[PDB]
Design a protein around this nucleic acid. Structure first.
Lengths: 251, 740, 704
RNA sequence: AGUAGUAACAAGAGCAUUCUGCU
């Protein structure tokens, strides 16, 4: 029983008349419009609303599985979750003491893919930690809005090719008419399919991990100095309005 | 000794300490009540600058329209709206002669972008005036309601998926005399509130199908929603801005795309540039006009604002400009780009939310709407509203006022820049053949014009020639708010140039506080906001350090996450103190978990969990980055690993409205969410890359289910009983699709 | 015709062909032979796929009448494009086949082969070899049918039975005969963008022209065939001479001063008392609440022995003052007996009056108010003008002075590594060390605490009359904590739905200032006398009365939001000073932090004594800039923003004269009128206008 | 009364560009 659960879910949804009308009338191009459909009063100040929502006992709404993972009362007597008034749905009101209790007395696990998913930021930190700073020099600054390489990507793969590589790796049936037209593309594809054999992770997560490893982004920025890819990340640090910090990234 | 901070200007120059003259730490002036009076003031001022035009009635809407252009020339320095068509076409022809191939290349890029743009581009941007609901819904909600009302009538070209077919449907919808729309209505009943024993009328907002006319749909399609602008700095009195409808958004998108392709290659435009590109443009116009061809060349600079910039530019001048820029182009492209000035010349302005009337004998009040204002006796108003209603009475068409002259604030923001840059491009040395020349820099309505000559009389003659040529095309330089000095110090859109030093104060300094999503999201947003202001909004190093300290202080107050060694006793301080006392390396704890502040000037680009990862306890980094945490939502495949930390939780939401039973209208959003969720169940890539298609959602999901059952049958884990059950259920779903 | 298609084909084939035509974007009026050809090819593919099964053993058994078996052919043609490509990719991922260049029309699970089926009207040989050259390389079984009555496949192999192709060719001959009877055979065999205006939008297009034109096509042909013959110069000859921008020369030694308004004196409009505030403090508090603000308020009230019977010293002239006295007596009696963390007062008549409950008229709908005779509009009046009084300059004098406490404790930073981090740390530490003990920092912390607690009590205690104390917490020079209490705020009812809905409150503030010396400052206040206090000094030790300033005030979510963020004043005052250091370093090309912050001479003019202009140091300048930002935040209005924006031009004009850049205006009188339009009744904007007049007189006397 | 300022709030549609602890 694998594909009959979602097919009976679709049968239950088509049993409703309004959902049948909406599923039959809205095309797959129009589902990119009704995904962002929002009918309701919008909070005009989320900062102020978080300020006065955090002053209440239960500002978090997490799933009902938290009724079995964490207790209801802490060691010092702090209540961690309460239910809602006549709402037995899979969402209960939680306390931030529950979050602190999970971070101090919850179950440990294995964390080996968190430096693998976020290897871009760990590469940034390893390049900044081993960087070697020079002195500051004060003069007037002439900074040009150049399309510099913020995310380097991969060699011999454009932005139009790396996204197709990722879509062939993690979503191989949902491609379309696109075809792979390089000789190192197939070796990269075989290596990425080999590395992602045993992943109990969401496919969007490995999709975005391969995106931040392979897809090259460029953005216009005022640069006065080295326009290499490892200098645009420290663009808030190596230049200002009246000075220029000299810095060589480690590596 | 009385303290005077302005005497600080006796030591330093004014541009070196101009930030003292920006009182941007207090609350900005908000508007109270309605935006009806400011809308009627905008309409009356727009018709009063243009009052010597030609009054006519529209053949379709019945609205009184005023035609100021090609009218009498101005006789005084009042702001005129009488733009001349021959001068506008000569200025666009001169802008074409100075930049050869600019118009052709920008039109070719616009044609290349017209055929490849989908309807989903209209889900972006600001909130759009929904003509269905007479309210400012978001862009995707208004677009979905417009597509639903088109599809429930006989207009279904927007099912092709491209934007130009939706625009052809918009244009074809004007012929239907029986447009049937599904609006929102409201029932009411007086229910006793069981908290104070008080009778209050509770309202139940539902849905109802109502039928329009041809004229009613034509008024609603040509309606802008006018509201006051709030949090606006630098003005004593408020103003009304407008929001376009859905039948004009795509045409305005294509016209502004054309004008953005024009303005990106004109060096005399202050759009669409950022901060440091605008500093570079100030330096470029100061170096272009510094070339002393002789020994005695007087170079003066006018820092200028334009008075009543939107009230004086007509949509007919923009129609002539968009027909002259697109010369030699295909006629479908010329007509498609000419739709938006035609719709803006025939436009109408919704008159806000009425007024509030007070009964002192019965001690009550009632907000009467703007549609009821034309049938209430004029003695029930104040003097200013009496004057405004008596002036606007002949312009009202079905609760809205006709606004055929003038533009509203921010609609054609890039095309008026093309007109201003054409006026600036008129005065070159090899074109004027006169004893003066100029070169300028043109934003939406601010300008910085540099006139060079040989004597000061030549500078005055260049000033008069620029000002009168601006008056010929509907541009009134504000003589109150403009001043001329020599070249070397000036101001352009709150960029203060002094002798090669530009001070940027266009952007207000942000709060540098909590954003309000969750703990990890606000930490990332706060460090990214500080880093972006260090790069693009010109924040100092020590000011950025104080912004880091202020953000960390505010973040620790808001989420109650002070350090473990604090003597403060908040709600979470006992659990945070327990976590602090049992942690070996306290430097690895997050700020949300009572750890120290890891951030400084050098590492604002690094996330917090990444920055402290080598200092965490292994049990603490296991509990924090646990992929089975109950706070982050877990998608079913058993569920996947959660790669987000436990501080990425979700706050409890309140979209409630007082005494309002909005059950009949909040259902469609959750139905659309269930449809997108089950489509993501069938097609797992629908959230990463948007799915392209033209069949229905149910047909694509049944076609996915049938071949998924067939592939799983022919390659293992699904038996023929399971395959037969899936195919029979697909037959049953198609059978309910037929006879539903 | 299309009716020839709809006569004899299946309706499901008609549905598939209609969807195939709607894919490419065409109506069946321009091309109906496409409809007939797509329906013919689709029915050929369907009859190729009709009744071809595979049982559980796996043999091709043609059945008629699904439950124990499955299909042999997967139909690819007739679906959508992306649906068919998902079908092709889902087949090729399982069978490890290469994807074809285009979409095949069928798939055989038995032969594991993509079938491309093509129905033509020309000869079968040329079309078969054209399709084989079209699909050269891809392992695709081709099958070409025609109306000529033949069939041509790859390697002459037929995966279908003989009766199957006999049925298909029989149907093809039936279609061939049915085409050559209704006169449709030869007309079927031998086979930019568009944006036009509908007539309603054509009438809208004719209405939106210059008045010399009646047709949109005529105006479009005029604009596309326009050639300029000197039109701008002819109109500039025709235009009047009164339209001119005449440059008037600007000399600040001849320009006049700003006209400040006249009337009554401007009253105090701050939410809390600034320089008249008195605090009851506890040093090193540990009193079993220790942080809960009502516990701190009781612990600070327990330090003041020497209460009296309160009597109304100075009456609020518009309001009932006995209500204010009873409000203070009720608050003092309820604090002495409260149990818990929060105190909600009993809604008596005087408290209902002071918080203004019941003053709003009952909001009804207009259809229930149609028969209401006396239904006049809300009145909208401009503010009444006020004369500048000398108390606000004294407030700004006392706000830029040092104290004994340390009011701001910033959080920690990371350890500094870069040299620019050390430079920024030195600069920020210099500014903090000069600015942290200022009185404006005490006002920053007072506003942060008051507006934070007012927001929390406004959102969690909406229906209740909450008491909110005015707490600050400071550290002394020896590093000892101290908790100060300035008064109380009785919050009203706060159901705030807009950003500008008013929550009313009652502020009762302790003070030592006799209110009858500057009575015009205290128009809205009702001042009582609540006690006596031994004021001690080096020699003198007296018993001065302790007063209580009671007033009704109000605020909103916007004002409370911007009051909780008043520490940004601390940012802005650092952003200014550092920019000065980021100007002197943009010329002298060194780190100008230490010449700025160690040459503590008296070369910074910030004062106006009767003997001339007084100069302070750089630390005095940073305290004055902080107090200016604090008073910009406390006394914010539209008048301040308008005056600042319109007087900045006059400041830049004076600077343009001082650089010998020969400034000139086009209309200086209108600029003066726009500046004087904004100086109405805010005490801070009147003080800033008199400051601009004093700076103008100083910049005149520096040149004569 | 008070906030406020071209029109509103001072509860009974928000018509958008059980809690409150900041050294």
């Amino acid at each position: 029983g694998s594909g009959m659960e979602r097919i009976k879910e679709l049968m239950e949804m088509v049993k409703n008349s309004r959902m049948r009308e909406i599923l039959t009338t809205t095309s797959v191009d129009h589902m990119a419009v009704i995904k962002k459909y929002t009918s309701g009063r919008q909070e005009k100040n989320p900062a102020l609303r978080m300020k006065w929502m955090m002053a209440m006992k239960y500002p978090i709404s997490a799933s009902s599985r938290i009724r079995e993972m964490i207790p209801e009362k802490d060691e010092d007597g702090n209540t961690l979750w309460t239910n809602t008034k006549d709402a037995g749905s899979n969402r209960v009101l939680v306390s931030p003491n529950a979050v602190t209790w999970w971070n101090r007395a919850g179950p440990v696990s294995d964390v080996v893919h968190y430096p693998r998913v976020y290897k871009m930021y760990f590469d940034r930190l390893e390049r900044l930690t081993h960087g070697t700073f020079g002195p500051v020099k004060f003069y007037n600054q002439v900074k040009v809005r150049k399309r510099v390489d913020i995310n380097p990507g991969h060699k011999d793969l454009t932005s139009r090719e790396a996204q197709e590589v990722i879509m062939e790796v993690v979503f191989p049936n949902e491609v379309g008419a696109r075809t792979l037209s390089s000789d190192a593309q197939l070796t990269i594809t075989k290596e990425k399919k080999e590395e992602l054999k045993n992943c109990k992770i969401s496919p969007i997560m490995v999709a975005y991990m391969l995106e931040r490893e392979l897809v090259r982004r460029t953005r216009f920025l005022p640069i006065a100095g080295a326009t290499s890819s490892t200098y645009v990340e420290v663009l808030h640090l190596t230049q200002g309005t009246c000075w220029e910090q000299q810095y060589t990234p480690g590596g | 000794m009385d303290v005077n901070p302005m005497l600080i200007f006796l030591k330093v120059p004014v541009q070196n300490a101009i930030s003292t003259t920006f009182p941007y730490t207090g609350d900005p002036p908000y508007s109270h009540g309605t935006g009806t009076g400011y809308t009627m003031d905008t309409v009356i001022r727009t018709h009063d600058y243009s009052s010597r035009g030609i009054w006519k009635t529209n053949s379709e809407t019945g609205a009184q329209q005023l035609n100021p252009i090609d009218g009498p020339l101005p006789e005084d320095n009042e702001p005129s709206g009488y733009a001349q068509t021959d001068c506008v076409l000569e200025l666009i022809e001169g802008l074409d002669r100075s930049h050869p191939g600019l118009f052709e290349t920008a039109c070719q890029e616009t044609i290349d972008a017209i055929q490849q743009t989908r309807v989903d581009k209209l889900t972006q941007g600001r909130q759009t005036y929904d003509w269905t609901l007479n309210r400012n819904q978001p862009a995707a909600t208004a677009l979905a309601n417009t597509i639903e009302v088109f599809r429930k009538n006989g207009y279904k070209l927007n099912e092709s998926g491209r934007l130009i077919d939706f625009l052809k449907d918009v244009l074809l919808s004007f012929e239907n005399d029986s447009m049937e729309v599904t609006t929102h209505f409201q029932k009411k009943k007086r229910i006793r509130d069981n908290h104070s024993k008080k009778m209050i009328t509770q309202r139940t907002i539902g849905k109802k199908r109502v039928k329009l006319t041809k004229k009613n749909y034509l008024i609603r399609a040509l309606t802008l929603n006018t509201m006051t602008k709030d949090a606006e700095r630098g003005k004593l009195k408020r103003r009304a801005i407008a929001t376009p409808g859905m039948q004009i958004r795509g045409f305005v998108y294509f016209v502004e795309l054309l004008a953005r392709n024009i303005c990106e290659r004109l060096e005399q435009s202050g759009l669409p540039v950022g901060g440091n590109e605008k500093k570079a443009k100030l330096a470029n116009v100061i170096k272009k006009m510094m070339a002393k061809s002789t020994d005695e060349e007087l170079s003066y600079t006018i820092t200028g604002d334009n008075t009543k910039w939107n009230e004086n530019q007509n949509p007919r001048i923009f129609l002539a400009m968009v027909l002259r820029i697109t010369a030699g182009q295909p006629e479908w492209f010329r007509d498609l780009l000419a739709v938006a000035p035609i719709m803006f010349s025939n436009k109408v302005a919704r008159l806000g939310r009425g007024y509030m009337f007070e009964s002192k004998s019965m001690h009550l009040r009632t907000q009467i709407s703007a549609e009821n204002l034309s049938d209430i006796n004029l003695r029930y108003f104040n003097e200013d509203t009496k004057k405004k209603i008596e002036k606007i009475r002949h312009l009202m068409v079905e609760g809205t006022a006709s606004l055929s002259p003038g533009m509203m604030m921010g609609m054609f923001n890039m095309l008026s820049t093309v007109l201003g840059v054409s006026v600036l491009n008129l005065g070159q040395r090899e074109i004027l053949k006169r004893t003066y020349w100029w070169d300028g820099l043109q934003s939406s309505d601010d300008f910085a014009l540099i006139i060079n000559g040989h004597f000061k009389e030549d500078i005055q003659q260049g000033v008069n020639h620029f000002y009168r040529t601006c008056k010929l095309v509907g541009i009134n330089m504000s003589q109150k708010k403009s001043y001329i000095n020599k070249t070397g110090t000036f101001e352009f859109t709150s960029f203060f140039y002094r002798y090669g030093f530009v001070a940027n104060f266009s952007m207000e300094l942000p709060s540098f506080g909590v954003a309000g999503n969750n703990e990890s999201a606000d930490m990332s947003i706060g460090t990214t906001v500080i880093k972006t202001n260090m790069i693009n909004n010109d924040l100092g190093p020590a000011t950025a350090q104080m912004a880091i300290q202020l953000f960390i202080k505010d973040y620790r107050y808001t989420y109650r996450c002070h350090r473990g060694d604090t003597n403060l006793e908040t709600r979470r301080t006992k659990s945070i103190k327990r976590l602090w006392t049992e942690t070996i390396s306290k430097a690895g704890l997050l700020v949300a978990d009572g750890g120290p502040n890891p951030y400084n000037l050098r590492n604002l680009h690094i996330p917090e969990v990444c920055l402290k990862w080598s200092l965490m306890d292994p049990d603490y980094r296991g509990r924090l980055c646990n992929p089975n945490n109950p706070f982050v939502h877990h998608m079913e495949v058993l569920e996947y690993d959660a790669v987000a930390t436990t501080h990425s939780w979700t706050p409890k939401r309140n979209r409630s409205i007082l005494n309002t039973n909005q059950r009949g209208i909040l259902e469609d959003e959750r139905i659309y969410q269930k449809c997108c969720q089950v489509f993501e169940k069938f097609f797992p890539s629908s959230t990463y890359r948007r799915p392209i298609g033209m069949a229905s959602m149910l047909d694509a999901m049944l076609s996915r289910a049938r071949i998924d059952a067939r592939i799983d049958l022919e390659s293992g884990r699904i038996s023929s009983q399971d395959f037969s059950e899936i195919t029979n259920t697909c037959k049953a779903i198609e059978a309910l699709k037929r006879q539903g | 015709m299309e009716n020839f298609v709809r006569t004899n084909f299946n309706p499901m084939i008609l549905e598939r062909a209609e969807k195939t035509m709607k894919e490419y974007g065409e109506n069946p009026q321009n091309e109906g032979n496409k409809f007939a050809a797509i329906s013919t090819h689709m029915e050929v593919c369907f009859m190729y796929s009709d009744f071809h099964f595979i049982d559980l053993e796996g043999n091709t058994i043609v059945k008629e009448n699904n439950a124990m078996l499955k299909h042999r052919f997967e139909i690819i043609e007739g679906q959508e494009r992306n649906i068919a490509w998902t079908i092709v990719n889902s087949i090729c991922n399982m069978t490890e086949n290469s994807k074809p260049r285009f979409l095949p029309d069928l798939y055989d699970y038995k032969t594991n082969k993509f079938i491309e089926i093509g129905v033509t009207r020309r000869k079968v040989e040329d079309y078969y070899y054209e399709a084989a050259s079209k699909l050269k390389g891809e392992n695709v079984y081709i099958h070409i049918f025609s109306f000529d009555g033949e069939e041509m496949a790859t390697d002459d192999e037929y995966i279908l039975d003989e009766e199957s192709r006999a049925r298909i060719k029989t149907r093809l001959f039936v279609l061939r005969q049915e085409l050559a009877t209704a006169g449709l055979w030869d007309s079927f065999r031998q086979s930019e963008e568009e944006f036009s205006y509908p007539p309603t939008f054509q009438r809208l297009a004719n209405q939106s022209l210059p008045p010399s034109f009646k047709d949109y096509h005529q105006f479009k042909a005029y604009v596309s065939s326009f050639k300029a013959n000197g039109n701008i110069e002819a109109k500039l000859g025709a235009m009047s001479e009164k339209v001119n921008a005449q440059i008037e020369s600007f000399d600040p030694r001849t320009i006049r001063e700003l006209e400040l308004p006249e009337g009554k004196f401007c009253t105090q409009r701050s939410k809390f008392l600034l320089m008249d505030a008195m605090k009851l403090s506890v040093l090193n508090p540990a009193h079993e609440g220790e942080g809960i603000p009502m516990k701190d308020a009781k612990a600070c009230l327990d330090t003041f022995w020497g209460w009296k019977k309160a009597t109304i010293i100075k009456k609020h002239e518009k309001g009932v003052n006995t209500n204010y006295l009873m409000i203070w007596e009720q608050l003092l009696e309820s604090i002495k007996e409260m149990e818990g963390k929060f105190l909600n007062l009993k809604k008596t008549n005087h408290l209902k009056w002071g918080l203004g409950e019941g003053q709003a008229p009952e909001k009804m709908d207009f259809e229930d108010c149609k028969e209401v005779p006396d239904l006049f509009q809300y009145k909208s009046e401009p503010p009444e003008k006020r004369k500048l009084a000398s108390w606000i300059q004294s407030e700004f004098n006392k706000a830029s002075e040092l104290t004994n406490s340390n009011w701001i404790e910033f959080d920690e930073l990371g350890n500094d590594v870069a040299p620019i981090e050390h430079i920024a740390s030195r600069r920020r530490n210099f500014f903090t060390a000069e600015v942290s003990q200022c009185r404006a920092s005490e006002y920053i912390m007072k506003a942060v605490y008051i507006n934070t607690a007012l927001l929390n009590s406004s959102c969690t205690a909406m229906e209740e009359y909450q008491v909110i104390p005015i707490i600050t917490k400071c550290r002394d020079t020896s590093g000892q904590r101290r908790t100060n209490l300035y008064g109380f705020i009785i919050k009203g009812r706060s159901h705030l739905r807009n950003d500008t809905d008013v929550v009313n409150f009652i502020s009762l503030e302790f003070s030592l200032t006799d209110p009858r010396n500057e009575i015009h400052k205290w128009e809205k206040y009702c001042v009582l006398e609540i006690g006596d206090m031994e004021i001690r000094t080096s020699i003198s030790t007296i018993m001065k009365p302790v007063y209580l300033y009671v007033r009704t005030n109000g605020t909103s979510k916007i004002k409370m939001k911007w009051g909780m963020e008043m520490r940004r004043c601390l940012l802005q005052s650092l952003q200014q000073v550092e920019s000065m250091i980021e100007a002197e370093s943009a010329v002298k090309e060194k780190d100008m932090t230490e010449p700025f912050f160690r040459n503590r001479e008296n070369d910074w003019p910030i004062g106006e004594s009767p003997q001339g202009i007084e100069k302070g140091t750089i630390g005095k300048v940073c305290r004055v800039l902080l107090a200016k930002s604090v008073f910009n935040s406390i006394y914010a209005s539209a008048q301040l923003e308008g005056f600042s924006a319109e007087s900045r031009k006059l400041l830049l004009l004076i600077q343009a004269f001082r650089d010998n850049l020969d400034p000139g205006t086009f209309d200086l009188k209108g600029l003066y009128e726009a500046i004087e339009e904004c100086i109405i009744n805010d005490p801070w904007v009147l003080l800033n206008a008199s400051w601009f007049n004093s700076f103008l007189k100083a910049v005149q006397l520096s040149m004569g």
